[PDB]
From Swiss-Prot, chains B, C:
Tagged with keyword DNA-binding: yes
GO cellular component: nucleoid
Subunit (UniProt): Homotetramer. Interacts with RecA.
Protein name (record): Single-stranded DNA-binding protein
Shown segment, full-protein numbering: 2 to 121 of 165
Length: 107, 115, 115, 107
C-alpha cells in the first residue's frame, strides 16, 4: 500500500555514486521540477546496477523522469520543533527525450 | 481541468512508427508492454502476470527524438494523459505522452541536448 | 512488479452495476466520465475538452460499499491499476479499482465504518 | 508542469477549518499512509467550498483518498542547516469506500 510519485525535472548536481560496506552501489541525486518560478526539489536515491547506470549516463542539468516511492521521516522537539524529511526511492529513471536524444546501450 | 494522467514502464513491442500530418506535424506512435509481477504460493518465487499493451502516441520534436532514440525492446518510462480515440464502430484508449525516456534500469545512455 | 496505476476523477455515467461470480464473489462495474478543461484564446474563458470514459470494475466488500454509496452522477476519485480485458475479437482497457470514494468537491458525506 | 500525487491513508486529527481575512475557507488536515510499520505523513490543505465539505464530512481516523500537487520549500543555514517543508494542495478528496459506506449529499 506504498505511495508512488512521478517527477520530471533536472538534476541539481552530478549523481553521487558510492558503495556501502555491503558492496552495494548507491546513487544519490536530487530532481528540480520547475514551472515556466519556485521549484519542487526532491532528494532521490537509487540502488544497485541502475545506480551505476545513472552515474555513467546522467549529469548536472540532465532532464529526467523518475517514478518511485515517497519515504518521509519526522523529527525535532528536543532541538527545534516540527521538522520533516522526504525522498524518493526510485524504481525507474530515464533521461527525458522532449528536448534531447539519447544513444541507448545494453549491458 | 485535471487531465487523467498516468505513468507507465515497459518495453516497446516494435520500433517507433513516425508519421506526419499532411502539413508536416510529426506524430510517432508505439505501444508499451508492461508485464506486472507477483509471488506464487506453495512453490514459486516470483512470476509475471498479465501483459498490458498501452497504445501510445506523441507529438512534435519529442516524437522525432523518440524516433532517433528508441527501438523494439526499449525499456521505457512514460508519463502522459489518457485520451479516447475512436474510428471506423468504437473507441480505443490511448496515452498522449507528455514525457518519455529509456529506463536506465538495464541500460546506459548518452543524452544529447537539443536547444 | 510495478503495476501501471492511475488516478481518475469524474462522475458515474450510470448507477453502479453489482454482480456476482457463480460462487458469490461481488463485482461491481461502473464507468467514469472525466471531462478535462482548457482556455479558449480570442474570447473564451475556460471550456471542457474531450470526455474520457474509463470502464471500472471493483471487487469484494468495496464493491458492495460502492453499490450502497454511489449513483449515476456521483463525483468520484478513483485510484487503481490498468488491466486489459478481452472478449468475443479484441481487447478493452479497464481500471481495477484499489480505492474509490465520492469527491467532497460539491458534496458532503456521512461515512459509516465497517470492521 | 506541476507534480501531482495520490495518497491513501487516515487523518491524524479532525480537519481544521478556518477563514482568512479575505473571507476564504481553509481546511488543514494531514494524511497517514500505513503499510500493514513506519508511515508516510503528509500535511494537506484544501480551500474554499470543498474545505467546508471536508470539515463537515471527515473526522479523525477517516480513511481518505487525496490527489493534489506537491509543494516543497527549503530553508535553514543561519540556524540549523538542511531543512525541508512539504505538503499537498488538494484538488480532490473523498472518504474511501474500501472499509466504509457513505451517505452522499448534494449542495
Amino acid at each position: 500500500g506504498d505511495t508512488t510519485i512521478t517527477v520530471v525535472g533536472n538534476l541539481t548536481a552530478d549523481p553521487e555514486l558510492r558503495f556501502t560496506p555491503s558492496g552495494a552501489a548507491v546513487a544519490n541525486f536530487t530532481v528540480a521540477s520547475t514551472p515556466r518560478g519556485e521549484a519542487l526539489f526532491l532528494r532521490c536515491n537509487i540502488w544497485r546496477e541502475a545506480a551505476e547506470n545513472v552515474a555513467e549516463s546522467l549529469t548536472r542539468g540532465s532532464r529526467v523522469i523518475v517514478t518511485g516511492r515517497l519515504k518521509q521521516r519526522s523529527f525535532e522537539t528536543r532541538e527545534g520543533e516540527k521538522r520533516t524529511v522526504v525522498e524518493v526511492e526510485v524504481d525507474e529513471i530515464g533521461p527525458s527525450l522532449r528536448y534531447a536524444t539519447a544513444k541507448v546501450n545494453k549491458a
